[PDB]
């Protein structure tokens, strides 16, 4: 099925009015919304409750404006990446199917979305091979759901997986199991990293790694993974976004890599991959309304430098480098797109090269 | 009227002045000819940032050790440390020194000139009021004459460092039966920079002498060259006027423009072009070819809580003050233009450039 | 005039109202008889604390589900959530409900009574000025009558929750050509609490009607029972007057005293004794024997930057706002008296108790 | 030799004037100062530069007012624990020897101090048995230096050991070694924990642990250890404080344990152990000038609770629990002593039981 993609701003933490307005104006249909991926204005760490508030707001609009039951609505994968430091604007990217009578099928590659949920992820699985294999299997399922057989047509895989809590850790130990760590913040970075290796395994980017590789072998990464985590579910939510020929629709996705926090060229590369023809040295004013959004990861390098210059991110006990780097890359990124509503996420283990991250772009080409 | 040598050096640690000492040993410049230092330090950028005083002592001790100047003479050298290097911003110092005429090529081309002055003491009473404004305008007058400049249009950058209010100085004001504009120490930073900036704008004929009521409230009143920073390392306004003069010689030239908002990379390019560095249209950092010494700019979160029509949550964020968010964001924006994370980005820009933006100055090496 | 049941319950998570639901199911109290809730939530305690709105929705949904009251009637129940549980402070809610006379033992002994009132809307314009003061004094009047109290001396605790200024409401004020006392959102919290407190002190005859100029500046003007908190969950002053009346019956009684500074455990003991709980001289937490329901108090960092002649660095700390430092400190001081980390400790106490201290109220179970 | 102990406030970050004044008034002699242990007003994390500034200030007073050379002065162990959240007042406890003609020797136990430096601590030693054994050996050396053979007369062991940095980690790997972790904040907690096990080994509190025990076996701890760490030295600084009979002097030290953050009784226990006779339920007003200082550790329990009440310290990404717990326990502690100048330190692995910490008290008894 062909996909409509719409990026809407959130006017406040519990606002889903722009989604409601798209529905009223006939831009998309509530019951055809199949995935939502957004940025929320919480702290972007462990105790970020803005992700819960947005979820309820969006689900209430979907239930109210459609014939779907609140149970069906609850199955819709909605992934919120918290923390909008600096200029980053809270927003949600909405993915919906399009009725056939609204589309002109084309052999040109156009956007497709696949979804899947993994098998249950036990606490003792988190960060270990069991998480990797269960994720890999669900990524293959989502890939098929998207109608994609070739991994090269996958450009962006957004996930949400569980973190470790006092309670789940207690559960692991009650059944004679161990856990990779007991620190909740660490368990997040771990859960993301293990999920990312699963993605890279599923897509043939890497051979199956060992337990020992997880968080250590930073040469091993997915070039399309975007992993987040939270306390909501005990399994992996997968959303695969790629292209398929013969489906029709207006939008196409592309990706590249950001080698470091300042790599605007890598963002331009993603937009070019997505199907825009741009000048050698593009500027935001060249986009002509055609860029829907970009989705990327970023991180502070372990060597404490960017382009041979020392920075103090890693030792900063006042403001965690997660927030510093997020705001920095938010600006770098919004300077390319000209739109502060950009999807910039942190916690990037095994997601792009060390000090960098994958970057995906969705563009509006027409039929 | 004397030619200037300008060198940007990294700080390897909080108390490191080794690269200054090395410049002196290699004959690049003479200790007694150092007339001003402007740098970035890795502290929190707020009130209780002691990284500014540590760098100050480190640099002054090098200057007094390697020269014939007395620690008293050395103490009158304006050294401005803008704390806070959120994100990629690399701790560094820009050193300005005079050069004997025998080492320069005189030219009718405009080349860099620097004037320095220390205002009268600024009491806590004065901060943010007409007393700060008139004392500053006076020291700016002095500095302009010291640079050999009579026309304000040749001024491209006025960097100041003034006191903010601390518990101790607020205790002082009240012990003498005086009053202070605010007792929120972190608020007092914004006020100190703002009052100083109006003093600069008064001295350069950019605005008519304002009233107490105008300070922080009349944001339409601003200097287009003022870069005012504040901290706890001298109870006087350290003033550094930087412009160009014809017939003096030297390798360096300064230019400026304005950043209309945090994402306005074109405004930074404009400054570099204004400084006389001939660049292609559609420039990229790879065009600089080692020729940009540094940029110096201000940034701020707009009072309307938006950038380019997109809401952000900076002004409501009680976790990480918007000073630090915007500083990291614009650090990245800026370093993406220069390709060098050692950039002078300072926050809190009341009456310094238009609201939501700031002035940006560039020093280039033209030979 | 009606007897009160008071129950303090833990919050197990941010959206947990299960212990309220359990009280209702076990017949401890009736949903429709809940007249006020006062609690602590685990958010940051500042402007962008959304844990208050999450708890609000959770509690109101229990009240509307288990009772015959309409969600509209339920919405008029004053629920005050003081965010920020730094240190040991345990998220919890104190529930106040009426009790049918058939379930109480009438007594000429003083026993708890509660009055409630919601003020008129508070515009952003009004916050911190006489308009807030006179609107509050009026709603406090209403609440006192609702509690069946004519003598202000029988009032021991007036808890309020008022709006603070946010970007959005500041945008509103200006869109209508109005002005605001400040635009520093986090500053506006201190102001909101202070203006409300003067309204309480005016209503209870503690002070003469003050001027705009007195707000935040005349700290000698205060209420000895006011506990004013502020946030973003209603644009009206939720007022809860708590005192004692003779001849009503019930198990609980309230008392109050004052904490002269953050370390004044004796002032907290004094409140408990005032409430009618007979304790040994030289009391210890082990003397309470289950009989202290909760304490409710304010704290603040003194303007002089000292406690008992010792300097602290709270007011100069740009990393962790003194709100959070003092809240954690007094949380521990307080919980060391009660032996129960579930204590109502709120920060920012302008015109609420003497400068550097705050009122403290205690509710005890006497049977 | 007999010891004089004096606690002085720091009026500012670079103030050592009260030390200078003690010397001028003849209270102690500069050249007889043998150790300094204090609290500084920095953030108490990794990037805390207030410890450097205080060091220089104190050493300059010692060099100026005595005949010791700046090299001899540099050998004086000075240990700064950063972070003074809440009411905690910056201060330094000064330990000096007393000339014989100033003392009356007594068989009563009185205060003694021993110092020692360990063998070099390589990065690969940190957190492992090599650190444990090298520390144990230096603790035995310091114990002998104090004139103590019985470990039961040791009440407080304050240390300073190295953390892991990018550079030292690079060194370890260049020589084919590994490190326990590469995170600097973690390396601090590790360095403290390993040092603490070394102390407990030296004093016979525990049998020699394994690598696997470090940071994991929290049942293993020293009841007198107080460990800090920083980038200054590559070996362990040890300061043993205990009692010896037959030496004379006015002061005596005692200790106990704080079982949890609210355990004022444990602090009272230490003061009683130190030789004060106090009421069953003591109050700060009973101390009658006799308490010099208390020295303790605190921490947030891994179970997320205090006395059966949940708190949100561990998940708080806005304000690290180190700062929360420090401020909370600062208040608890200052409420017992009545003096906000208290030595409260965090990072307490293997230093007291889990959720608690050792507490030591020095009291003034006379001859
Ligand atoms: N694991 C995550 O979800 C990391 N998140 C945490 C959060 O959303 O609060 C930050 C981000 O996505 O940028
Ligand atoms: N007072 C200020 O201007 C803040 N300063 C930071 C500082 O204290 O140095 C300049 C900046 O970072 O913007
Ligand atoms: N506005 C306030 O009073 C802050 N509030 C916290 C909050 O937002 O709930 C009370 C407190 O913690 O002291
Ligand atoms: N390891 C340490 O030194 C922990 N410190 C760190 C610091 O001093 O900055 C905090 C404390 O001692 O309470
Ligand atoms: Cl169809
Ligand atoms: Cl002697
Ligand atoms: Na990466
Ligand atoms: Na500006
Ligand atoms: Na008060
Ligand atoms: Na411990």
Please pick, among D39, D140, D160, D297, the residue that the annotation labels catalytic: D160
Q: Around B356, how many Cα atoms within 13 Å sit in the side-chain half-sphere? A: 17
Quickly list DSSP for B277-327.
Answer: ----SS--GGGSTT-EEEEEEEE---TTSEETTEE--GGG-SSS-HHHHHH
Task: Give the helix ranges, DSSP H, for chain C.
Answer: 18-25, 51-66, 71-74, 130-146, 167-175, 185-203, 265-274, 322-338
| Tokens read off for D352 | 């007291």
Locate the domains of chain C by residue range.
1-105, 106-250, 251-367
CB contact under 8 A, B314 and A86: yes
Question: Please, what is the angle between helix A50-65 and helix A17-24, to 10°?
Answer: 20
What is the distance between the alpha carbons of residues D267 and D256, in angstroms, rounded to a whole number? 7
End-to-end distance of chain A based on CA atoms, in angstroms?
A: 14
3-state helix, strand, coil in chain C (%, to 5): 35, 25, 40
Which DSSP string do the residues of B339-350 spell out, in sequence order? S-S--EEEE--T
**Residues 6+ positions from A277 with CB-CB distance below 8 Å:** none
B229 lines ligand 2 (CB under 6 A): yes
Distance from C-alpha of C294 to C-alpha of C364, rounded to nearest angstrom: 7
CA of A82 relative to ligand 1 center, distance in Å = 5
Question: If you write DSSP's letter for every residue of B8-62 in order, what string do you get?
Answer: EEE-SSTT--HHHHHHHHTTSS-GGGEEEEEEEESS-SSTT--HHHHHHHHHHHH
Tokens at residue D289, please? 């000038």
DSSP assignment, residue C100? -
Please pick, among D191, D222, D226, D228, the residue that the annotation labels catalytic.
D228
Please report the number of interchain residue pairs, chain C to chain D, with beta-carbon separation below 8 angstroms: 139
Q: Which residues contact D71 (CB under 8 A, 6 or more apart)?
A: none
Query: What's the C176 CA to ligand 3 centre distance in angstroms?
Result: 28
The CA–CA distances, whole Å, from C3 to A157, C106, C107, C291 equal: 59, 9, 11, 18
Cβ-based burial of C25 (10 A; exposed 0-12, middle 13-18, buried ≥19): exposed
How many angstroms separate the CA atoms of A245 and A109, rounded?
4
Closest-CA residue of A relative to B282 is A281
> In angstroms, rounded to a whole number, what is the distance separating the alpha carbons of residues D154 and D71?
29
Reported residue count of chain D is: 367
Which residue carries 């935040």 as its tokens?
Answer: C216
Ligand 2 pocket check for B199: Cβ under 6 Å: no
Separation between Cα atoms, residue C85 and residue B123, nearest integer Å = 39
Contact D194, D132 (CB under 8 A): yes
Contact residues, chain A, for B358 at CB < 8 Å: none
The ligand with the least distance to the CA atom of C193 is 3
Cα of C339 vs centre of ligand 9, distance in Å, is: 24
Q: How distant, in Å, are the alpha carbons of C302, C304, D15, D326, D337 from that of C356?
A: 4, 9, 26, 20, 19
Interface of D with B in 312-331 (CB under 8 A): 318
Per DSSP, C164 falls in state: -
**Residue D115: Cβ within 10 Å count:** 19
Chain A residues within an 8 Å CB radius of B341 = 262, 306-307, 309, 311
What is the 8-class DSSP label of residue B91? P
**DSSP annotation of B352:** B
Locate the ligand 4 atom nearest the alpha carbon of residue D163 and give its number. Answer: 1
d(CA A243, CA A254): 9
Report CB contact under 8 Å: A302, D182. yes
Catalytic residue flag (residue D327): no
**CATH number of B251-367: 3.40.50.720, 3.40.50.10540, 3.30.70.260, 3.30.1330.160?**
3.30.1330.160
Annotation says D228 is catalytic: yes
> In the beta sheet, which residues pair with residue A158?
A226, A239
Query: By C-alpha distance, which of A135, A130, A133 is closest to A118?
Result: A135
Going by the DSSP 8-state scheme, the letter that residue D89 receives in this structure is: P
Scored b (16 or more CB within 10 A) or e, C273-287 reads bbbbbebeeebbbeb
**Residue B13 CB contacts under 8 Å (≥ 6 apart), including other chains:** none
Tokens 């991959």 map to which residue? A273
- Tokens for D357? 């910490």
Helix, strand, or coil here: B107? coil
Report how far residue D258's alpha carbon sits from residue D306's, in angstroms, rounded to the nearest whole number: 13
The C-alpha angle with vertex D80 and arms to D75 and D81, in degrees rounded to 5, equals: 150
Q: Is the CB of C39 under 6 A from ligand 3?
A: no
Q: Which of B118, B152, B159 is nearest to B360 (CA)?
A: B159
Q: Which numbered ligand comes closest to the C-alpha of A222? A: 7
Q: How far apart are the C-alpha atoms of D314 and A46, rounded to whole Å?
A: 9
> Distance (Å) from the C-alpha of residue C312 to the closest C-alpha of chain D?
5
Which tokens go with C237? 């002053």
Sign of CA dihedral D275, D276, D280, D283: negative
* d(C-alpha D78, C-alpha D1), whole Å: 19
CATH number of this structure's domain D250-367 = 3.30.1330.160
Contact between B87 and A261 (Cβ < 8 Å): yes
H/E run at residue D40? strand D33-40
Print the SS3 string covering chain A. CCEEEEEEECCCCCCCHHHHHHHHCCCCCHHHEEEEEEEECCCCCCCCCHHHHHHHHHHHHHHHHCCCCHHHHHCCCEEEEECCCCCCCCEEEEEEECCHHHCCCCCCCEEEEEEEEEEECCHHHCCCHHHHHHHHHHHHHHHHHCCCCCHHHEEEEEEEEECCCHHHHHHHHHCCCCCCCCCHHHHHHHHHHHHHHHHHHHCCCCCCCCHHHCCCCCCCCECCEEEEEECCCCEEEEEEEEEECCCCCCEEEEEEEECCCCCHHHHHHHHHHCCCCCCCCCCHHHCCCCEEEEEEECCCCCCCEECCEECCCCCCCCCCHHHHHHHHHHHHHHHHHCCCCCEEECCCCCECCCCCEEEEEEEECCC
Q: Which residues fall within 8 angstroms of residue C80, CB to CB, at 6 or more apart? A: C36, C37, C38, C39, C159, C160, C161, C229, C238, C240
Asked if D232 contacts D160 with a C-beta cutoff of 8 angstroms, the reply is: yes
Strands of A343-345's sheet in order across: A251-258, A357-364, A291-297, A343-345
Q: Which residues does ligand 1 sit against, CB inside 6 Å? A: A 42, 44-45, 48, 51, 81-83, 188, 192, 228-229, 345-347
Question: Which chains form contacts with chain B, at 3 or more CB pairs under 8 Å?
Answer: A, C, D
Tokens of A100: 């056939």
Subunits with 3+ Cβ pairs within 8 Å of A are: B, C, D
Q: What DSSP character marks residue D203? A: T
Q: Which CATH superfamily groups domain B1-105? A: Cyanuric acid hydrolase/Barbiturase, RU A (3.30.1330.170)
Distance from chain centroid for Cα D266: 17
Report the run of H or E that residue D39 belongs to, with start and end.
strand D33-40
Pocket test for ligand 4, best of D346, D349, D350, D357 (most atoms within 8 A of CB): D346
Q: With the C-alpha atoms ordered A67, A70, A74, A79, is the resulting torsion angle positive or negative?
A: positive
Q: Please give the interface size between A and B, counted as residue pairs whose CB atoms are below 8 Å apart.
A: 139
Cβ(B49) – ligand 2 distance below 6 Å? yes
Q: How far is A53 from chain C (nearest CA, A)?
A: 8
For residue C55, CA distances in Å to B7, C11, C82, C230, C313 come to 57, 9, 11, 15, 33
The Cβ-side half-sphere exposure at C299, using a 13 Å CA radius, reads 31
Distance from the alpha carbon of residue A324 to the mean position of ligand 8, in angstroms: 22
d(CA A261, CA A304): 12
Structure tokens at C91: 């998220």
Q: What separation in angstroms does the CA of D177 have from each of A140, D140, D172, D192, D210?
A: 40, 28, 5, 21, 18
Q: Is A224 annotated as a binding residue?
A: no
D42: three-class secondary structure by DSSP: coil
C-beta of residue C44 within 8 angstroms of C-beta of residue D318: yes
Secondary structure of residue C358 in the 3-state scheme: strand
Q: Which fold has domain A105-249?
A: 60s Ribosomal Protein L30; Chain: A; (3.30.1330)
Distance of CA D32 to the CA centre of its chain: 20
Closest CA to B358 of B236, B271, B291, B279: B271
Question: Cα separation of B346 and B339, whole Å?
Answer: 18
Alpha-carbon distance values, D267 to D18, D87, D258, D322, D330 (Å):
27, 17, 7, 20, 12
Closest CA to C334 of A219, B39, D309, A323: D309
CA D60 from centre of chain: 22
Whether ligand 3 lies within 6 angstroms of the CB of C82 is answered as yes
Query: How many CB atoms lie under 10 A from the CB of residue B290?
Result: 7
Nearest to D349 by CA among D185, D207, D117: D185
Instruction: Report the residue of chain D nearest A319, measured CA to CA.
Output: D318
Q: Looking at domain B106-250, what is its CATH homologous superfamily? A: Cyanuric acid hydrolase/Barbiturase, RU B (3.30.1330.180)
Kindly state whether B102 is in contact with chain D, defined as any CB-CB distance less than 8 angstroms. Answer: no
Cα–Cα nearest to C88, from D344, D333, D311, D329: D311
What is the C-alpha to C-alpha distance for residues D49 and D42, in angstroms, rounded to an integer?
7
Look at the alpha carbons of A17, A18, A21, A26 in this order and tell me if their dihedral is positive or negative: negative
Interchain proximity B328–A332, CB inside 8 Å: no
Residues of C in contact with D328 (CB under 8 A): 86-88, 328-329, 331-332
**Cα–Cα distance measured from residue D329 to residue B312, given in angstroms and rounded to the nearest whole number:** 37
Across the interface, of B47, B171, B305, the residue whose CB is closest to C171 is B305
The structure tokens 């480098």 sit at: A321
Residue of minimum CA distance from atom 7 in ligand 3: C83
Shortest-distance atom of ligand 3 to CA C81: 9
Q: What's the residue count for chain A?
A: 367
Give contacts of D 237-266 with C, CB under 8 A.
Answer: 261-262, 264
**Contact, D254 vs D344, CB < 8 A?**
no
**Which CATH number among 3.40.50.1700, 3.30.465.10, 3.30.1330.170, 3.40.640.10 corresponds to the domain D1-104?**
3.30.1330.170
One fold for D105-249 and D250-367: yes
Contact list, D302 vs chain A (CB under 8 Å): 166, 182
Comparing CA positions, the residue from B37, B318, B48, B355 lying closest to residue B197 is: B355
> To 5 degrees, how large is the angle CA B359–CA B362–CA B365?
170
Burial of A231 (0-12, 13-18, 19+ CB in 10 A): middle
Q: What is the CA radius of gyration of chain A?
A: 19
**Chain C window 164-203: which residues touch A at a Cβ cutoff of 8 Å?**
168
The token pair that represents D124 in the structure block: 């690969």
Closest Cβ opposite residue D312 in set A47, A185, A320: A47
**According to DSSP H, which parts of C129-288 are helical?**
130-146, 167-175, 185-203, 265-274
Contacts of D13 (CB under 8 A, 6+ apart): B50, D40, D41, D50, D53, D54, D90
C320 burial via Cβ count (<10 Å: 0-12, 13-18, 19+): buried
Q: How far is C10 from chain D (nearest CA, A)?
A: 8
Expressed in angstroms, the distance from the first to the final Cα of chain C is 19
């Amino acid at each position: 099925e062909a996909i409509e993609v719409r990026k809407v701003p959130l006017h406040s933490v519990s606002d889903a009015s722009e989604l409601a307005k798209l529905i009223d104006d006939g831009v998309l249909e509530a019951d055809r919304v199949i995935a939502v991926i957004g940025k929320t204005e919480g702290n972007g760490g462990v105790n970020d409750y803005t992700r819960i508030i947005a979820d309820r707001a969006f689900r209430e609009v979907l239930s109210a404006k459609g014939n779907r039951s609140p149970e069906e609505v609850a199955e819709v994968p909605i992934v919120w990446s918290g923390g909008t430091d600096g200029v980053i604007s809270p927003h949600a990217t909405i993915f919906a199917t399009v009725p056939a009578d609204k589309v002109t099928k084309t052999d040109e590659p156009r956007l497709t979305v696949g979804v899947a949920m993994s098998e249950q992820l036990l606490p003792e699985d988190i960060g270990r091979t069991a998480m990797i294999t269960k994720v890999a299997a669900a990524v293959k399922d989502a890939m098929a759901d998207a109608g994609i057989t070739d991994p090269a047509d996958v450009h962006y895989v957004q996930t949400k997986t569980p973190l470790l809590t006092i309670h789940t850790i207690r559960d692991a130990k009650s059944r004679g199991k161990t856990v990779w760590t007991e620190q909740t913040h660490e368990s997040m970075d771990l859960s993301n990293g293990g999920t990312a290796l699963g993605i890279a395994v599923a897509l043939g980017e890497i051979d199956m790694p060992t337990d020992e590789d997880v968080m250590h072998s930073r040469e091993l990464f997915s070039s399309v993974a975007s992993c987040s985590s939270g306390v909501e579910l005990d399994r992996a939510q997968i959303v695969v976004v790629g292209n398929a020929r013969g489906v029709g629709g207006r939008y196409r996705i592309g990706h590249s890599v950001m080698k470091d926090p300042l790599d605007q060229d890598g963002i331009w590369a993603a937009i070019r991959d997505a199907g825009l023809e741009l000048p050698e040295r593009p500027h935001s004013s060249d986009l002509d309304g055609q860029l829907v959004n970009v989705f990327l990861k970023c991180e502070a390098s372990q060597d404490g430098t960017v382009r041979g210059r020392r920075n103090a991110m890693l030792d900063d006990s006042d403001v965690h480098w997660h927030r510093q780097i997020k705001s920095c890359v938010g600006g770098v990124t919004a300077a390319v797109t000209g739109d502060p509503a950009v999807f910039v996420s942190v916690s990037a283990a095994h997601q792009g090269p060390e000090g960098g991250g994958p970057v995906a772009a969705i563009v509006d080409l027409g039929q």
